[PDB]
Amino acid sequence: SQPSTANGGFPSVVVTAVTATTSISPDIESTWKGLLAGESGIHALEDEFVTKWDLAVKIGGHLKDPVDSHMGRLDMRRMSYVQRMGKLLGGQLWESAGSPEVDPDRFAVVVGTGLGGAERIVESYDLMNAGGPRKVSPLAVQMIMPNGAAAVIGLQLGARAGVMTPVSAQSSGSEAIAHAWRQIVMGDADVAVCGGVEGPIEALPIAAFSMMRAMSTRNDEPERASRPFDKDRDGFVFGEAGALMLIETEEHAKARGAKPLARLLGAGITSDAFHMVAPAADGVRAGRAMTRSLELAGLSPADIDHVNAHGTATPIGDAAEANAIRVAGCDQAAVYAPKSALGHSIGAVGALESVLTVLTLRDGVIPPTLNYETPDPEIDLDVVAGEPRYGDYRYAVNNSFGFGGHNVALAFGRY
Amino acid sequence: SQPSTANGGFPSVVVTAVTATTSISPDIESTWKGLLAGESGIHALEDEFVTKWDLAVKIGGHLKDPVDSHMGRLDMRRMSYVQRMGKLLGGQLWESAGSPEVDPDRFAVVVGTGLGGAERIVESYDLMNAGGPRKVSPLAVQMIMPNGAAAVIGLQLGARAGVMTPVSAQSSGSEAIAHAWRQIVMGDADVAVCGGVEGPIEALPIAAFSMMRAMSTRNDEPERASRPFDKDRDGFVFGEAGALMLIETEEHAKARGAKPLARLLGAGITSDAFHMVAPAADGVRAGRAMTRSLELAGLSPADIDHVNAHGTATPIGDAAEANAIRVAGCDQAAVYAPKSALGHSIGAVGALESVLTVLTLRDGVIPPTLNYETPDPEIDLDVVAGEPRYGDYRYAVNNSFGFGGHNVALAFGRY
Ligand code: NA
Ligand code: NA
């Protein structure tokens, strides 16, 4: 018989702490209550690079509390933005967990990102062109390497059982956590800090995503633009985030008297082999990922009460994911799509949405999916909307999919 | 009794085909032959950006046969460099394995890289600065995304059991092979194309790496510059490469009639939590990676006949690595350092060197480490040199270490 969490095959792994910075708040708890009050982080873009380039997208969600307003002249010179965000959340998370003294030989870190420290690439490039090789920072390399944030967090908190950085574009935050759960259940570690980081909204990233027609242009109502599964959706809205969580065996937590917020039960990772940016319309492979997170957890489709959807709010994207949920036998679960209020944080998004899945299992509630005003016939899912819905949610799947056809599903439980 | 490969805990995994392009040959069997004949792939840099930027480093090993000389006008505009390298090697490896017909849903891809399609970032940046947002191509995100090369190979070959990209700098290509094994013995896959690809020697990469002052500046004698474990080493040499290997269950391979070139038995991934770019002096966490690989393969250190050494030819790296080999208790092993001849390929190197470890095992011979002319006392390793060294090699560890504090060790065995 194949091992699973349920049959004692895998060690029990629990979530003991979470941390996030959102367009709604620097505090995950304030964001949670903000989401439950039906609030949106999406505002009008006020950065002068908007009119300057007369961008077709003029809305989005900046962090409520700027990362760099916590960052010294040394950090600003020595780190890239993701590395700085990494330090912040990495710092904030450890205190939240009581600042545990762990055996770092049993302590890993896994944090994904969309690109890494890309501002440092263009800077180093501008400088070399104007003043040559000597103008390049001796720290250019470590600031640019996309494993930069993870390495910073590993060094910062002291992890010596591996610092890993999975990249799969928009599912990097989920895959980050899925690999942290593997390192643990395979005997490589006892505890791990995991999640995803990502950079702030800028001109170049808007242009690149706009030129694919992937982004909403409902500029005149910033808070109505992001409409996952709504019949009138027209693409995603940028919504800056960063998120981390602490996971450890249920016995490691027990020992240090740590109260688990939820359980991480299993992880599924598949691929489409279909298109470089378009999701496979049939949802089969994405649905296989959900199934696979279930098999490792020892749960059946019927067991799943909630589904935190990727829900980017694009026509083919939300439609492909509706099919995915039906292949997985999970179309009778209560569905929520956080991007309705928090936008798309690319590499961070999956990890932020994983913390929301955990807060749903802890608190027994699902926030309303914003802007869900016209059910799309093709979708046909139980989209929680209008009000927060309460129930004894016991099992949930967090979904995330990236460009390259990456499908990451995480099985969660209530502690 | 925890699972090992020897005790039955894990499925048996075999390497059934390999492919590599280097500074010596576009052909892995001809690179091997020249490496044994005592060939260097390093030469004088004749690119005009060399004089233009007056760079302190004017030596490196360009690819014997340029990737773009095999790429049409279509591929040249729809892919970044590393995507185009991966397409070439993916298709080269596939045929070398016989163009197998495998279950797509049990077929995975894990390829590591240093940063991704970075040339496309600076191109899109120049384009926008010069003609605005609509001068960014709709294909830029898929060309830039760090997972791009792996996605391209997964689309190309049809990998629907996961397409992953681990990034850990210089160990990226080793860690990818690590994660494919994991992926198979965890039962998410039965066959996996895996390794690393990397971009070419270019002006801005040289500038950035020599600003850290860790590059050899021995431009008068390109072939004698990369001197790992030599007392008179002065930093690393760029040597271009990309490489892939095909792994599968011994059962999957027997059922299609593939001849295993070696076995993949285990892997260990740890981290130093010491410095952002420098390895830990004591080599402890690094040795621990090696140790972890043996614990999983079911081997004692006394069984390891040969260590394929990261051996970057920097003072502190070689010094730290020798200590890790003693921590691992593998100091009686025959040590080869391939960078002495083929140079450093960053994201691709650990994969290239994993392929070499397989040819050592298969052909029961080790090539000479070039330039090893003065034994450095502190080092104290049995380094192969002068002439290749034949012998009865049954097991071997391949070491890869990366900026950010990463240590990857892979345990291989003769089939
Ligand atoms: Na989600
Ligand atoms: Na090596």
Side-chain angles (χ1 to χ4, degrees), chain B residues 308-310 336 338-339 350 353-354 398-400:
Chain B
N308 195 291
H310 181 71
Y336 177 46
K339 280 187 196 56
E353 281 159 357
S354 293
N398 175 60
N399 283 348
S400 198

Short mmCIF file of all heavy atoms in Angstrom, two decimals, chain B residues 308-310 336 338-339 350 353-354 398-400, ligand 2:
data_model
loop_
_atom_site.label_atom_id
_atom_site.label_comp_id
_atom_site.label_asym_id
_atom_site.label_seq_id
_atom_site.Cartn_x
_atom_site.Cartn_y
_atom_site.Cartn_z
N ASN B 308 33.53 13.39 -7.92
CA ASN B 308 33.58 14.41 -8.95
C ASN B 308 33.42 15.75 -8.26
O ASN B 308 32.36 16.06 -7.71
CB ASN B 308 32.50 14.19 -10.01
CG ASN B 308 32.74 15.00 -11.29
OD1 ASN B 308 32.64 16.23 -11.28
ND2 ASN B 308 33.06 14.32 -12.39
N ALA B 309 34.49 16.53 -8.25
CA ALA B 309 34.54 17.71 -7.41
C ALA B 309 34.06 18.98 -8.11
O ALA B 309 34.43 19.26 -9.25
CB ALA B 309 35.96 17.90 -6.85
N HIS B 310 33.20 19.72 -7.43
CA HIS B 310 32.83 21.06 -7.86
C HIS B 310 34.09 21.82 -8.27
O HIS B 310 34.16 22.37 -9.37
CB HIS B 310 32.11 21.76 -6.70
CG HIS B 310 31.65 23.14 -7.02
ND1 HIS B 310 30.60 23.40 -7.88
CD2 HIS B 310 32.10 24.35 -6.60
CE1 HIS B 310 30.43 24.70 -7.97
NE2 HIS B 310 31.32 25.30 -7.21
N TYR B 336 38.34 13.95 -9.19
CA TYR B 336 38.45 14.66 -10.46
C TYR B 336 37.77 16.02 -10.39
O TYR B 336 36.69 16.16 -9.84
CB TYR B 336 37.83 13.83 -11.59
CG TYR B 336 37.83 14.50 -12.94
CD1 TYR B 336 38.97 15.13 -13.42
CD2 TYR B 336 36.69 14.48 -13.75
CE1 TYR B 336 38.98 15.73 -14.67
CE2 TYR B 336 36.69 15.08 -15.00
CZ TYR B 336 37.85 15.70 -15.46
OH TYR B 336 37.87 16.30 -16.70
N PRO B 338 36.55 18.62 -13.13
CA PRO B 338 36.31 18.85 -14.56
C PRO B 338 36.43 20.30 -15.01
O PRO B 338 36.60 20.55 -16.21
CB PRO B 338 34.84 18.41 -14.76
CG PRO B 338 34.44 17.72 -13.50
CD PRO B 338 35.31 18.28 -12.41
N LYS B 339 36.33 21.24 -14.08
CA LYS B 339 36.41 22.66 -14.40
C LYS B 339 37.82 23.06 -14.83
O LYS B 339 38.03 24.11 -15.43
CB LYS B 339 35.92 23.52 -13.23
CG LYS B 339 34.41 23.62 -13.11
CD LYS B 339 34.00 24.62 -12.03
CE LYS B 339 32.53 24.44 -11.63
NZ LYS B 339 32.22 23.05 -11.18
N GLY B 350 26.64 21.65 -12.85
CA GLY B 350 26.40 20.48 -12.02
C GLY B 350 25.77 19.33 -12.78
O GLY B 350 25.96 18.17 -12.42
N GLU B 353 28.61 17.89 -15.07
CA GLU B 353 29.50 17.09 -14.24
C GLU B 353 28.85 15.80 -13.73
O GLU B 353 29.53 14.82 -13.45
CB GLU B 353 30.06 17.94 -13.09
CG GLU B 353 31.21 18.84 -13.50
CD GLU B 353 31.44 20.01 -12.55
OE1 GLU B 353 30.67 20.15 -11.58
OE2 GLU B 353 32.39 20.79 -12.77
N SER B 354 27.52 15.81 -13.60
CA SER B 354 26.78 14.58 -13.32
C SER B 354 26.87 13.60 -14.50
O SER B 354 26.97 12.39 -14.30
CB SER B 354 25.30 14.88 -13.02
OG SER B 354 25.15 15.59 -11.79
N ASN B 398 28.95 13.18 -6.89
CA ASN B 398 29.12 14.38 -7.69
C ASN B 398 28.69 15.60 -6.89
O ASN B 398 27.51 15.73 -6.54
CB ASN B 398 28.30 14.29 -8.98
CG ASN B 398 28.35 15.58 -9.79
OD1 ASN B 398 29.41 16.02 -10.20
ND2 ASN B 398 27.19 16.16 -10.04
N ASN B 399 29.66 16.48 -6.62
CA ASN B 399 29.46 17.64 -5.76
C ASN B 399 29.17 18.93 -6.52
O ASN B 399 29.92 19.31 -7.42
CB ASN B 399 30.69 17.87 -4.90
CG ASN B 399 30.78 16.92 -3.74
OD1 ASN B 399 29.82 16.21 -3.43
ND2 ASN B 399 31.93 16.90 -3.07
N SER B 400 28.10 19.61 -6.14
CA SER B 400 27.79 20.92 -6.72
C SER B 400 27.43 21.92 -5.61
O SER B 400 26.58 21.64 -4.75
CB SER B 400 26.67 20.79 -7.76
OG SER B 400 26.62 21.91 -8.63
NA NA C 2 31.22 18.06 -9.73
#
